[PDB]
Amino acid sequence: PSTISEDSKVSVTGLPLNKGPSEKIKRESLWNDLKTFLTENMTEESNIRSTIGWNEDFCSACNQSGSFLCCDTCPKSFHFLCLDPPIDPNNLPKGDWHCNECKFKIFINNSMATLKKIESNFIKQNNNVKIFAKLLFNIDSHNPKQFQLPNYIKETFPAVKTGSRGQYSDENDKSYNPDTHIDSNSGKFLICYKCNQTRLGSWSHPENSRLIMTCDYCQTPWHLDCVPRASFKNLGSKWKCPLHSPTKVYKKYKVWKKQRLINKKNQLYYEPLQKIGYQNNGNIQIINQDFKITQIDENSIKYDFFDKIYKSKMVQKR
Amino acid sequence: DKRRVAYFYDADVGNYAYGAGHPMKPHRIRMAHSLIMNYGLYKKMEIYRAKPATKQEMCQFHTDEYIDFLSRVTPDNLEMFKRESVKFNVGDDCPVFDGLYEYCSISGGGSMEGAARLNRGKCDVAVNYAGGLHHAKKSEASGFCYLNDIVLGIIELLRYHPRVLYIDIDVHHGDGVEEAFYTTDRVMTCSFHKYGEFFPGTGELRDIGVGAGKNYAVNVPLRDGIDDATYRSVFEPVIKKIMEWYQPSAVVLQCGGDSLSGDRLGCFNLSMEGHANCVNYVKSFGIPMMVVGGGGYTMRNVARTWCFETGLLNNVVLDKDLPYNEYYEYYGPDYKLSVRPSNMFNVNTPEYLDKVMTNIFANLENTK
Amino acid sequence: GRDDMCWEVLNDEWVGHPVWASEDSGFIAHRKNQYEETLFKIEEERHEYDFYIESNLRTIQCLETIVNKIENSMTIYKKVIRKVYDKERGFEIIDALHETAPVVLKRLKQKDEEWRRAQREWNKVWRELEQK
Amino acid sequence: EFALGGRCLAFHGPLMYEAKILKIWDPSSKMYTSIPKPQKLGEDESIPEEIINGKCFFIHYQGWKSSWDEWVGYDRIRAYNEENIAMKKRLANEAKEAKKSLLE
Ligand SMILES: [Zn+2]
Ligand SMILES: [Zn+2]
Ligand SMILES: [Zn+2]
Ligand SMILES: [Zn+2]
Ligand SMILES: [Zn+2]
Known part of the structure; x- marks a missing residue:
């Protein structure tokens, strides 16, 4: 053709x-x-x-x-x-x-x-x-x-939510900007815990400002340079500053985990009586019967730490 | 130095195009070749056309099912190929075009032959910009990459060298290559890349390697728009320490244009000479080199970059004026040989970089 | 093809799969001004023009080396023939060639001439647009 | 639980109505803190004498018009927790049962 x-x-x-x-x-x-x-x-x-x-x-x-x-x-x-x-x-x-x-x-x-x-x-x-x-x-x-899950095991824990298609979701899901250093509700600056400064630099000299993330849990301001970090946390999980409990321990192995959040209807708070020696888990409170949270009597924390250091001394001393 | 530089180029690499809007075009290789040729550099290198690799050689690192699917998949036969498309990530991010198998074979053959020539001693400098697909890892296409011929290069070099060092300067982390040697201590992967909500997402600072590859993997997390004066400052001391301490026999360098100023996808503020500084410093140690070409989606920039680097490796400095290549229109208003950085603010503070240096050197303190 | 040394030096236990490292959220790209986007558009149009022209030229040279032989790298030519004979008649004509070379060669040369003319006009337009 | 702008759930007969706090009363200083705040008792603002000396709060009932703002003390304003939600649902169900008994 x-x-x-x-x-x-x-x-x-x-x-x-x-x-x-x-x-x-x-x-x-x-x-x-x-x-x-x-x-x-x-x-x-x-x-x-x-x-x-x-x-x-x-x-x-x-x-x-x-x-x-x-x-x-x-x-x-x-x-x-x-x-x-x-x-x-x-x-x-x-x-x-x-x-x-x-x-x-x-x-x-x-x-x-x-x-x-x-x-x-x-x-x-x-x-x-x-x-x-x-x-x-x-x-x-x-x-x-x-x-x-049958719509009620989940409700046993008021810290979990179902995602879009049905997935797991919890409490950690989540040019020159000098306004980032301002509280905007008290007019104060963001004094980072590590640096004890805000490091605002200036509009004339923007190359002196230091970035802050202001941890997503206890709202503590932190420099990107005070703690090594390349960029902000915006898409992934909620950022948490290192002033928080591990909630999970690997010791040599052996694994430790903290209990989950339950409704206070079913929460059974308990307080000991010895107040000096009482072996408890990490489920403590500073002031089905399996998730009892100890009310730790804060001075007991100090005491327990002290003789613990003493024992760590005498294991190698004698 | 005055190194005997061999060179590889197939005239079929500019005739395989990706999707219409796809940022990956190997045509940049072809105008880079023309930039090399019209400058009169052809009298200073050993030009070759390496044989394309075969399935038995890709199965050294890749899998038989993966290679078999690669050799038969076609835009025409795609509709019955549904399980492998999802299984090996061969869909939209890494699309299937007419000559995918041919291009992959060409890149693998070129890089594998370059490693062979480095082994035999024909040249101490082998260059293959066609290779450099540092993202695919043995079972899946990733980051527009389909075949990680780089690992084949290190495999062939390790056949002769007790230690081989891999450096990645692409703004993308060398995920596939670092994964291929995360456990072995023969190869160090050292990737300079942007760390954040970036496409690699890997390359964390605390990725020194697992198993016997512990402390044998270096990741450099960087913030946006680093410039020459800061990139060289973060580059040179770490390279010095690695060479002084790990002391490789062979070494491989990935030269991607993605970190170029004003890259289509890049975000770094490197000019021409900031990029060439790393090449000069690497060639400053004398050990054999196998230069590949990775990222970069502004072909008018990466062609100039690659031409300048091939001039530099031959210990000559090329002219700033164009030799009137065929694709003259591509090279901007002034038609010079340079990359002009932009006015953007570099956020890489010295304190974060210093902490990075401290961590990297402390980790390397145990790699005599 | 995996040799024993390949089994030794490789690693198949630990994989990252950046989607796992990305928290399955995604990746944040970079911000680009509209001028950069126009530059990208011009670059894309240039690349398409030059790629078509180079493929056509390569197939033209191959057909010349064939016709000068018959007077008395496996997919480029089929692709360009199908593009030229976009009426789905490329499938039959490729095999007809495999067993008509001058007519397809001259049609390719004509298409090359028109493509180069259009490329020159578009190069003028692209340069004028870019210079500002 | 009890703060300016915070949610609260207050009793009203055999059922509760959830509201949002706007003013926090300080009986010691005879003063309330409001938000758009050290300021005396307003010229048109007053609290019932049984809650003028207690920790009273100005709350707005959600789903109700802005004209139904009420000064409720600690007596009915409960602590918004899981028990509060469960108990609101419990008395809502009891109201439903009372309605059904009135019907069937
Ligand atoms: Zn049915
Ligand atoms: Zn289904
Ligand atoms: Zn700080
Ligand atoms: Zn915190
Ligand atoms: Zn790249």
């Missing part, structure tokens, strides 16, 4: 690459030792290598978008992994696929005979385990679903 009539369609320039100036752009974008041909010869093919000789937009189980094996009998959408059993998309069933509920509604669900089926299943399990017989029968009628 003669030529490609649909030759010049479009290019990055917007023009079909075969028109040129685009006069509107002309008015917009205007005012009013040899060559490389010798490289064919001085290029030597080097192969001296040592190895040269070698319906819905969400899954009906995960409630998320993605690969969907939708149905026709019931307008449902499932992820291929979010299916029981998990089916490989490579070897497609290539046929009519119905959900488990659709299968039960078609094969079994005669409006009255379903009682006959459940009765038969119960009487094939009444002699055997029958407490689970009803559940064992009924779970065969349900579509697979992603496992989620």
Whole structure:
């Protein structure tokens, strides 16, 4: 055939690459030792290598978008992994696929005979385990679903929240700017704990100001230079200054963790009586019966520290 | 120095384009080549065209499934390739184009041949800007990188050298390369990069290495828009200490244009001579060099940068006037050979840098 | 292809996967002025023009070395032929060549001429825009 | 719990109404602190004598108009915690049960 009539369609320039100036752009974008041909010869093919000789937009189980094996009998959408059993998309069933509920509604669900089926299943399990017989029968009628906590274990802890698709989320999720050094509610400067300064520099000399992050937990101002840090914490977790408890200890191994935040309805505060020697966890209070927080009687902290240092001395002294 | 400099270039590297808006174009290699040639430098280097690598050589570090998927995937056959696309991160960030396999083979062959030539002693200076994909790590395309031929280069150099040192100056951390040698003590990876909410995100200061690679990995966290006078000051003492202490036999340097002033994605304030300072300091120690080309998405700038560096390695200083290359239009109003830094404020305070020096040197105090 | 020394020096236990290091939030890019964006647009248009021209020129030279032989690096030519014969007839014509070389070569040369003319006009426009 | 601008939950009969604090009373100085604050009792501001000498607070009921601002002391203004929310829900459920008994 003669030529490609649909030759010049479009290019990055917007023009079909075969028109040129685009006069509107002309008015917009205007005012009013040899060559490389010798490289064919001085290029030597080097192969001296040592190895040269070698319906819905969400899954009906995960409630998320993605690969969907939708149905026709019931307008449902499932992820291929979010299916029981998990089916490989490579070897497609290539046929009519119905959900488990659709299968039960078609094969079994005669409006009255379903009682006959459940009765038969119960009487094939009444002699055997029958407490689970009803559940064992009924779970065969349900579509697979992603496992989620039962809406009350989470509520047992008032420090956790569910993310967008269902993820875990907690209390740590989160040119020249001299205003960053101003409290703006008391008019005071941000005296960093480490440097004891704000280091505002000046507008005339911006190269003397020092950046501050003002820790996201106890609001303590800190220089980026007082503690080594390259940039602010803006996208990730909430920044916390090093004036906070570890809440987790690896000792040589052995792991220690602090208990979680529970509702004060179920919180059982307790106070000891010895006040000098009382082995407690890190769950202390400075002033189901398993999460008792000790009221530590602060002077007891001093005492316990003192004889502890004494024992650390006598272990190596005697 | 007066080093015998070999050079590698395939004339097919400028004929493989990424997506239309994609910042990764290897055409920059081709006008960099033209900048090298029209300056009369072709009489000072040994030009070669290395053989493209084969699957058996990429499987040295990469995986058989990964390489196999690479050799068969095509924009035409993409729609049936769905599991591997997500599995190996070969989707949008690292797109699939017409000659992806050819380009990867060319880059790997060039770098692997450069390491081979360094091993045999044909040259003490091997240069391959086509390679330098320091982001992909053995199973996945990352940072527009698909094949980490750099690790193949270090593999071949280690075949001859007891110790090989890797330096990364790309504003992006050398994630794939440092991961490839996080546990071994033969190779030190030393990456100068921007640390923050940046695409690498890795390269933390306390990343000295795990296992036997403990204290054998250096990460330099930096803030925005460092300039020549500060980049050289943070560069030279650490390189001095590493050379004096780790004392590598071979050494590899990644020369990415991403840290250039006014890079399409870069945020550093390095001019031409600030960048060339690192190359001069590295060549100031005498050990064999295998120069690659990494980041950089302003081809008019990286071409000039690479031409100046190849002039510098041959111990000559090129003219500031252009030799009238073919792609003359690319080189701005004055058509000079330089990168002009901008007026932005450099935030790298000396105290943070000093703490960085203290930490790095204290860690290195145990690497006789 | 992993040799024993490769098994020795490599590392497959510890991986970072920056998404894990990014807290799955994302990455903060850099701020660029509109002038920089216009420079990027001009650079992109230049790169597209030059890439098309170079691919066409390489295929033209290869077709010349073929036709001068028949008078009596594996995907560039197929790609440029498909681009030129964008009517989906490139698939058949590539194999027809594999078994018509002068006509496709001369069509490529004509396309090269038009592309170079348009590139010169666009170079003028680009320079005029950039200079300010 | 009890601060200027902070949330609070105050009793009102067999049910509670959540409010936001605006003024904090100091019986010792006969003074309240407000926010847009050392200042005497206002010319139009006054507190009932059973809470003039106690730690009273000026609160605004959320979901209610700005004309329903009330001076409530420590007697009804409770501490906003998990127990406070659970107990508000408890008396809301008891009000629901009373309504249902009035109906069914
Ligand atoms: Zn799903
Ligand atoms: Zn169904
Ligand atoms: Zn400070
Ligand atoms: Zn703090
Ligand atoms: Zn880079």
